[PDB]
Amino acid sequence: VKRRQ
Amino acid sequence: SVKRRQI
Amino acid sequence: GTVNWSVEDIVKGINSNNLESQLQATQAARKLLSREKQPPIDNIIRAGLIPKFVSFLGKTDCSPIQFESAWALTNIASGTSEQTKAVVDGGAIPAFISLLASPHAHISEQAVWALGNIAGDGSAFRDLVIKHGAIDPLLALLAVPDLSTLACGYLRNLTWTLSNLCRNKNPAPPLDAVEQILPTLVRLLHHNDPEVLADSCWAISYLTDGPNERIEMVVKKGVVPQLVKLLGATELPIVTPALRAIGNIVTGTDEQTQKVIDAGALAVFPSLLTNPKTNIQKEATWTMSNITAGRQDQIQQVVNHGLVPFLVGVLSKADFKTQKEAAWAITNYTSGGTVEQIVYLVHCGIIEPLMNLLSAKDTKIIQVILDAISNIFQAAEKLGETEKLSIMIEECGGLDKIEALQRHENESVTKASLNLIEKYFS
Fold this sequence. Notes:
The complex is a heterotrimer, with two copies of chain A and one copy of chain C. Chain A is low in regular secondary structure. By secondary structure, chain C is mostly helical.
């Protein structure tokens, strides 16, 4: 569940 | 900004 | 001599058919455009001077007027998109690229600067500068055995312009352009000038701001150890883009994230998570949140490096945007971690600062926190210790927060509210 910038 | 003015 | 000319006098000299009169009028325009307070860029544009400046770029037998007109156009291009467009519309892009090979270093440098301003406007002008063929002659200026032999300002300007060719998405720069630039970028990332290092990291931060395939192009160049080294620099202008690049890389695959851990990045985060600059603390916690979204062995590295107490710290006291990132780190941790890892999180004191943040009004952080509480209860179910966690939550006022949250305006928070009370608080 990565969250981009 | 990523622009530069030369003084 | 050429100080404080009116635009009218500049136009008169430039239209004069006298090359020396034109040179003096162009220098006067340069000095006007180089003053600190409100350069009259629009006045110069409206006078129709850009086509004449562009034609002066090609006067090989008078290098002073090439320099002065390049400087004048550089500063016009430093303005708004409209003002940069006027420079491009006058045909300046191929003229400046031609000047990159000038034998006069100060003229070559001026063309580098101008192209950096044009490419820096946005992806369209960036890609237009690339289509005109700027990358080959720009990289050739750095084709020396040791960068230390180049003039300091010359090298800083080239690094900045190259970084603008790496900047922006929608779309990202052409893949072949990125591949052509990267080896020089890697070389600049190992240079010993702080400004070159800062702009090299910014360039890498741009190239890693995208899908995993873009991150992989950078990670495969072996630059992660150098990025981690720059993470520990004393200069904030270096740490900021280095941290941005590292944080971008850990948004990729578990394997790309592992390269960051392998390089020793976690050892810097006690400093980063307590850094007095709010933005560093926020982006370091964001980075931590994407690492705790990884594999259980990567969560374990966060544990081994003593970073869970630091996450408790930022959750307890930080800028609210940093606290929101800390909440994400906790929910990601509790979503992928083992029972033991989740137990260790409670032992470090995560519960009370978690409950205290349920007073916030940012509806998303409440959803994030409520998810984390459910995840921790699910681990406490496997140990049969839900009643112990319920006592912890009610003893620090958390039950009063959840029991008053079933009447919230968002509905996914009211459903999560009531579900927790029905199962564990009855």
